[PDB]
């Protein structure tokens, strides 16, 4: 694994044993924008700064943003054992272990134009039956870099892929190249 992986899995475990999965997801989504905006991240980093000055502001952020009492405990421990310089990685990693625990898959639909959502629900149902997702969190982006249609990227990160926008001209140029 990794430090981010092992810490995010511990957070998801302590947030699943006492069910706050929606609450801890909202809390980590608030914490991702808190620990973005790089001055405050530098401040909780920058080990020259006193730990007490870190912890004062950390408790005040707990108060102002209404965080959960176990996610606040998690960031207190990230301050205690100096893994706070990886907190961006830990928060970016928490979403994957959260999707593993909630059995959700998340798969991008890079298309050209928007959809009427019926074929999108069809694609979501297909990608949830082929992967065993009890509730796939299908997503999409509007990208003009594509040519014609759509493609799905599911699995771990984007590990699997079926594509019908540009694959046909790719195989046509490969076939006429005959090399």
């Amino acid at each position: 694994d990794s430090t981010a992986s092992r810490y995010a899995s511990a957070l998801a475990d302590v947030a699943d044993v006492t069910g706050t999965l929606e609450a801890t997801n909202s809390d980590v989504e608030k914490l991702i924008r808190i620990f973005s905006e790089e001055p405050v991240y530098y401040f909780f980093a920058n080990p020259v700064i006193s730990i007490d000055n870190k912890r004062s502001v950390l408790d005040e952020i707990i108060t102002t943003s209404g965080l959960q009492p176990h996610t606040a405990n998690f960031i207190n421990i990230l301050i205690d054992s100096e893994r706070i310089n990886l907190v961006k990685e830990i928060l970016n990693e928490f979403e994957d272990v959260f999707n593993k625990i909630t059995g959700t898959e998340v798969a991008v639909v890079t298309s050209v134009v928007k959809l009427e959502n019926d074929h999108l629900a069809q694609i979501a149902k297909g990608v949830q039956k082929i992967t065993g997702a009890k509730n796939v969190r299908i997503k999409t982006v509007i990208d003009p870099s594509l040519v014609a249609g759509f493609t799905i990227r599911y699995g771990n990160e984007g590990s699997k892929l079926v594509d019908m926008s540009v694959k046909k001209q790719l195989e046509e140029i490969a076939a006429q190249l005959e090399m």
């Binding site: 001055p39 405050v40 530098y42 401040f43 020259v48 700064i49 502001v57 005040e60 102002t64 943003s65």
Partner: protein, 68 residues
């Protein structure tokens, strides 16, 4: 929620500004003639540094976070 906790944000800025002074670092570790310094963002490689006791050093190792 920082736009709401703007007072907390300004206190964070005030805490930060004490540490990131220009041409000023802070000793992280020191022993056996080697020092690790936090800061000194605008230091040249091979520049001379001073250590508040008159001990002089040379910045040979400019890593991303510290300076050897």
């Amino acid at each position: 929620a920082d736009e709401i906790s703007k007072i907390i944000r300004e206190r964070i800025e005030g805490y930060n500004r004490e540490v990131k002074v220009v041409n000023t670092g802070t000793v992280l570790q020191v022993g056996d003639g080697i020092a690790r310094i936090h800061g000194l963002d605008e230091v040249m490689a091979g520049e001379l540094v001073e250590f508040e006791e008159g001990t002089i050093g040379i910045a040979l190792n400019l890593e991303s976070n510290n300076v050897g």
